[PDB]
């Protein structure tokens with residue numbers, strides 16, 4: 001069974017600016033359109049996986065972005081500790097959901113930021129965990145995660161403020177494929193990626209797709225769900241065996257997130 005956690009946009013707005021996509025967008029989201037877009041995404045994901053919901057909290061508009069609730073492996077979750085006070089109030093609500101749903105929760109020190117699956121994505125065969133740092137999660141959190149979850153952690157440094165979470169520019173896929181935007185990473189981190197993923201398994205995104213959040217994609221088996229995709233990228237994905245489903249998420253891009261950011265896979269098998 002594959003299960004994905006989402007959180008509906010009952011209280012969604014753009015109320016502050018903590019990433020560059022939010023600049024100029026305060027109160028520019030339409031709550032009604034956001035509901036419509038989220039409902040279409042929810043339906044599309046539910047066609048591929050079970051969807052669980054956590055009740056949203058008023059005053060925490062970014063709670064829709066459940067990718068940042070924590071990092072799940074098996075029965076364990078490393079709870080996120082947000083870098084910004086504007087999201088720290090989500091933490092007790094996410095903790096309560098994990099506890100109520102049978103997970104055993106690990107908490108980092110309150111001074112050590114780490115933003116969950118948004119910044120840390122497993123290689124889909126379970127060989128290691130790719131973990132971003134540079135804007136939200138601290139590099140020093142990576143050894144904690146490695147030990148708590150008994151996984152090798154491969155740290156990747158983000159260098160572009162637009163691509164401030166790993167999942168905005170990097171997406172492990174089924175079959176060992178990796179969908180990513182190399183310019184979001186420094187040279188050393190690109191070499192680290194390249195050492196592990198050979199060219200035939202790389203699906204390299206160009207900037208025009210990256211800025212439409214193409215890497216912020218939900219992949220269940222051979223299905224990939226995203227906001228918008230160029231024909232060029234759709235054909236590359238089709239050639240690699242994936243079926244692309246697009247669903248519009250413009251109201252969430254105003255807050256710096258798209259399809260993947262609105263999801264957390266809570267069934268991450270031990271392999």
Ligand SMILES: NC(=[NH2+])NCCC[C@H](N)C(=O)O
Nearest residue numbers: 019065067118165255257261
């Ligand atoms: N996993 C993600 N890409 N999350 C996007 C979160 C967007 C939210 N406004 C923030 O700045 O934190």
